[PDB]
């Protein structure tokens, strides 16, 4: 089965690259699978996302592309988690729609944060039974109109720090988006052209 799986992967990239000459290298970041099925659903009529093992695609392009060189510009390039999107349309329009379609993923417990978000002052309106978590985080709250209200603004999370379990849950309960990212494109391959 494994021998079958690899070989049909080889002919899969070979025939499609011979069918699709222009490509992106897409950073396969911490991207949930629910978004990946969605990102192609938004892309179903236009393109397809495709990736794999970093050497899986590599030996595919050295082992079967001596017939047509000039695709070897990527041989340095494929490092880390990467991805190949394959449209036959223009570059910038297909560039931004992948960038624009970003899903506000939650803050997984144990993941570094690149963004700094601080809550503003407001009455969240949830039930007045989760007040114990706020005491753990240090903020003092009181019951106004039978709901949880935060008195003052305190710092929530800075960039490049480890998140906490109770904070991770409380951020989700407030329904306030944390630092979030989706598929990010590094640079572009357009028939032997290199562009960021």
């Amino acid at each position: 089965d494994r021998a079958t799986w690899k070989s049909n992967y080889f002919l899969k990239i070979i025939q499609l690259l011979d069918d699709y000459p222009k490509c992106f290298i897409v950073g396969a970041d911490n991207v949930g699978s629910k978004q990946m099925q969605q990102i192609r659903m938004s892309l179903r009529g236009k393109a397809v996302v495709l990736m794999g093992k970093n050497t899986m695609m590599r030996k595919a392009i050295r082992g079967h592309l001596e017939n047509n060189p000039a695709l070897e510009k990527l041989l340095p390039h494929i490092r880390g988690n990467v991805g190949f999107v394959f449209t036959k349309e223009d570059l910038t329009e297909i560039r931004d729609m992948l960038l624009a379609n970003k899903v506000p993923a939650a803050a997984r417990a144990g993941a570094i944060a690149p963004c700094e978000v601080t809550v503003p002052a407001q009455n969240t309106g949830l039930g007045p039974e989760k007040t114990s978590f706020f005491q753990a985080l240090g903020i003092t709250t009181k019951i106004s109109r039978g709901t949880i209200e935060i008195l003052s603004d305190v710092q929530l999370i800075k960039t490049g720090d480890k998140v906490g379990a109770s904070e991770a849950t409380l951020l989700n309960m407030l329904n306030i988006s944390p630092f979030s990212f989706g598929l990010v494109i590094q640079q572009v391959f357009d028939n032997g052209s290199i562009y960021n």
Partner: protein, 52 residues
């Protein structure tokens, strides 16, 4: 009233440990065979029971 991260820190040394099913030794959570001689280094291992 302990902050949960401190509780987990304590749980690392007191709760999160392996117990040998023959000699009741205290082993690190990744143990596969008991380190003691008096049971013959069995692989019969059970986790320490939690207070949940």
């Amino acid at each position: 009233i302990i902050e949960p991260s401190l509780r987990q820190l304590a749980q690392k040394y007191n709760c999160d440990k392996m117990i040998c099913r023959k000699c009741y030794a205290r082993l690190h959570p990744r143990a596969v065979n008991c380190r003691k001689k008096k049971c013959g280094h069995t692989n019969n291992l059970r986790p320490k029971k939690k207070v949940k």
